[PDB]
Amino acid sequence: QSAVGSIETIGFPGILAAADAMVKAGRITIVGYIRAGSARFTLNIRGDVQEVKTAMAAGIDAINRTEGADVKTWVIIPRPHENVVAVLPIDFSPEVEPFREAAE
Amino acid sequence: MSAQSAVGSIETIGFPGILAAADAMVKAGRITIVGYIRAGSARFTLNIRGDVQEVKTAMAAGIDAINRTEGADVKTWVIIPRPHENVVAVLPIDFSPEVEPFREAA
Amino acid sequence: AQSAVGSIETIGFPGILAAADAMVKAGRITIVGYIRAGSARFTLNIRGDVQEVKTAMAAGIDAINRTEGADVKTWVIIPRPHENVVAVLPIDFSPEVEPFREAAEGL
Amino acid sequence: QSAVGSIETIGFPGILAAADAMVKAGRITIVGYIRAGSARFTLNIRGDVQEVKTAMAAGIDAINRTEGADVKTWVIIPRPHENVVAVLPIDFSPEVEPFREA
Amino acid sequence: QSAVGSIETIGFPGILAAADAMVKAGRITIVGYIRAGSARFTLNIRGDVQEVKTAMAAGIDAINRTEGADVKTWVIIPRPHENVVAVLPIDFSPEVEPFREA
Amino acid sequence: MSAQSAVGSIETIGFPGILAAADAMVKAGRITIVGYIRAGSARFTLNIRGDVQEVKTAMAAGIDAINRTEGADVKTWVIIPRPHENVVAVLPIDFSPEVEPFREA
């Protein structure tokens, strides 16, 4: 299992900013987002651990430059367990398969 | 060829504000409104696509329209000039058959 | 030519029920829908001739403000909404409200 | 169109208290409830205007007697327009027709 | 109609604590739960009124021992009207039919 | 015959925190993650099943992972060692086809 990164902000424009900065800074795949409630949004990515760290640094900085946005919470799990991947929305799906291949 | 068109995103509290933004934006720039999100806590997001400069013009018009609306305020906004294809595939900012007549017209 | 759209929002369902009834009785308009916006806020959306929407809107504001526990949070009137707006936001007519559309215009 | 009454409280236990008190106090029909958000719940009833007034009074008192509940907002509309009944969830349904008839 | 009890906590762990304590303390059937919003959860139970009383006290005690939980609101209706049972989510279902029998 | 396995439940603000807790719990104890809840107000619940001591060990690890996570805090948690069947029937803590593989290991 490749590493997983997750980041959360208030507002959709912030997570859009995070998304574009993350995928351009690191060789990673965006696998999903969550409408978390209370206008908070989460973005989830996968990749080599060093690449997720690089991307996450970029996503933090991008949210903090976005009007009205700030980083609420984030984490990186270097090697997620299969039970985690099965239950939480962090697995790959056919719609992002083309981007996984490009990254690897 | 062409790159992905720019994406603009704006958010306010209350639906009347986002209605004001939508109408001002599409009248002020050569853009397509591609969707809206009921974000929670009575916040609404509007997402638009178009040439970078038309998105910048539309966004100024949207900001001004929200600030003129009773009980509305701009909470947050962004423009991404050249969105990556992975972003367009995962987040609700792509075109759809419903709005395809308007992309055409733009 | 796209008819005007009016939108109004309050905290709590009773206040939006009050708005809806006052609006439809005060102006020759059609109520086209409502939104459960979140945080117990509710939106009502109406269509009709611009002057009828204005009259209906004034009546709705006053009805909400008279309702126990409610007040007007936000509202707007767009005289001539763009087709891209009508297509994306829930402000278009539907079969369920066509009978009301016809009556307002026909009267 | 018979009258409509609507009441809203914080928490489900209060709306349950209101529902039971209203239907026992007045000749009315409970037509629906709404999970409004933020743990608020709405109850909507139909009936003759005087019966709706009687039920509403009983509903408010029941909420105030309920542990942790408070009345947030309420209204009565004597003669709701048909467009209102068509768009908002205040109409009768097969599930409550037996109660409409009684 | 048997009695109905309804209780609401902040957080899911509390409603889980309540549920387990309630069904062990009295001869009741848990009939459903509600994700109410704002991280509040409601539990609904049915049974003889004395058994619902016994269960409710046990639910309250259990919530108050649960880290981070709190009782927000609760009620007991001895004999709910059939209109209430039809509209609000407090009736029995096939999934809980075995527990109703005991 | 067999008793119902123990259930643990934990809640924090934000998804990153629940992700941290899930990975730490499943690695620390012989447990199955059976589900999560988007609780509202950006709070997320995670529910796990296992032997009583394994759930206890997993929960301690989940609490420490949430507290180490930027922007997360443990809001509430509980362990029920022996949940009643009616509870498992009504609340979302039962096993499912998706997690059957993990139950067996």
Give one DSSP letter per residue of A30-41, joined into a string.
Answer: EEEEEEEETTEE
> Which residues in chain D have Cβ-Cβ distances shorter than 8 Å to C31?
83-84, 86-87
Q: Is E74 helix (H, G, I), strand (E, B) or coil?
A: strand
Cβ of F71: how many Cβ atoms within 10 Å? 16
Question: Given the DSSP bridges, would you call strands A71-77 and A40-47 parallel, antiparallel or unpaired?
Answer: unpaired
Mutation choice for F interface testing from A53, A63, A73, A90 by most F CBs within 10 A: A73
Residue F12's CB: how many other CB atoms inside 10 A? 31
In 3D space, the residue among B88, B66, B11 whose CA is nearest the CA of residue A10 turns out to be B11
Lookup: tokens for F33: 């993650």
Residues facing A75 on adjacent strands: A6
Separation CA A18–CA A99 (nearest Å): 17
- CA C43 to CA C19: how far, in whole Å? 10
Positive or negative torsion for Cα A82, A83, A88, A93: positive
Which structure tokens are listed for E94? 């096939």
Residue whose structure tokens are 């611009």: C50
Length of chain F: 105
Question: Each residue of F33-67: b (16+ CB within 10 Å) or e?
Answer: bbbbbbbbbbbbbbbbbbeeebbbbbbebbbebbe
**Domain range for residue D36?**
1-102
Backbone angles phi, psi at F29, to 5 degrees: -125, 160
Cα C105 to Cα C11: distance, rounded to the nearest angstrom? 31
To 10 degrees, the CA torsion angle through A94, A98, A102, A103? Answer: -30
* DSSP 3-state of E77: strand
At D44, which helix (H) or strand (E)? strand D40-47
Within 8 A of F18 by CB-CB distance, chain A residues are 88
Element (H, E) at F15: helix F15-28
Distance between F78 CA and the closest CA of chain E, angstroms: 5
> Whats the size of chain B, residue-wise?
106
Chain E residues whose CB is inside 8 A of the D39 CB are 8, 36-38, 40, 72
- The answer to whether the CB atoms of F45 and E12 lie below 8 A apart is yes
Structure determined via: X-ray
* Counted domains in chain A: 1
Q: Between chains, do B86 and A95 touch, taking CB under 8 Å as contact?
A: no
Length of chain A measured in residues: 104
CA distances from residue B54 to A67, B25, B61, B91, E96 in whole angstroms, order as listed: 19, 9, 11, 21, 59
Q: Does C35 contact B15 at a Cβ distance shorter than 8 Å?
A: yes
**CA gap E77, B56 in Å, rounded:** 59
Q: What are phi and psi of B44, to 5 degrees?
A: -125, 140
List chains adjacent to chain F, taking adjacency as at least 3 C-beta pairs closer than 8 Å: A, E
The order of strands in the sheet holding B43-50 is B31-40, B43-50, B6-13, B74-80
CB C30 within 8 A of CB C100: yes
> Smallest CA–CA separation between F31 and chain A, in Å?
10
Report yes or no on chains F and C touching (3+ CB pairs under 8 A).
Answer: no
- Cβ–Cβ below 8 Å for F41 and A42: no
Residues F66, F68, F69, F74, Cα dihedral to 10°: 30
**Are residues D62 and D20 in contact, defined by beta-carbon separation less than 8 angstroms?**
yes
Residues D44 and D31: beta-carbon distance below 8 Å: yes
The neighbour count for residue D48, using CB atoms within 10 Å, is 14
Q: Which two tokens stand for residue A27?
A: 């060789």
Contact E44, E80 (CB under 8 A): no
Q: In what order do the strands lie in the sheet with C30-38?
A: C30-38, C41-48, C4-11, C72-78
Q: Does B26 contact C82 at a Cβ distance shorter than 8 Å?
A: yes
What's at D24, amino acid-wise?
K
Give Cα separations from B88 to A14, A32, B76 (angstroms). 15, 11, 20
Whole-number Å distance between alpha carbons of C57 and C36: 19
Pairwise CB contact (< 8 Å): D15 & E82: no
CB contact under 8 A, D68 and E74: yes
Helix boundaries (H) for A1-104: 12-25, 49-65, 82-87, 97-103
CB burial of residue E1 (10 Å; 0-12, 13-18, 19+): middle
* Cα of E72 vs its chain's centroid, Å: 13
- CATH number of the domain enclosing C47: 3.30.70.1710
- Return the bridge partners of A74, or none: A7
Q: Edge-to-edge strands of the sheet including F74-80?
A: F31-40, F43-50, F6-13, F74-80
> Which residues on chain C are in Cβ contact (under 8 Å) with D73?
11-15, 67-70
Q: Which of D8, D80, D86 sits opposite C14 (nearest CB)?
A: D8
Spatial distance between the Cα atoms of D100 and E31, rounded to a whole number of angstroms: 26
Please report, as a single letter, which amino acid is at residue B62. G
Task: Specify the amino acid at residue C16.
Answer: I
Nearest CA in chain D to E38: D38
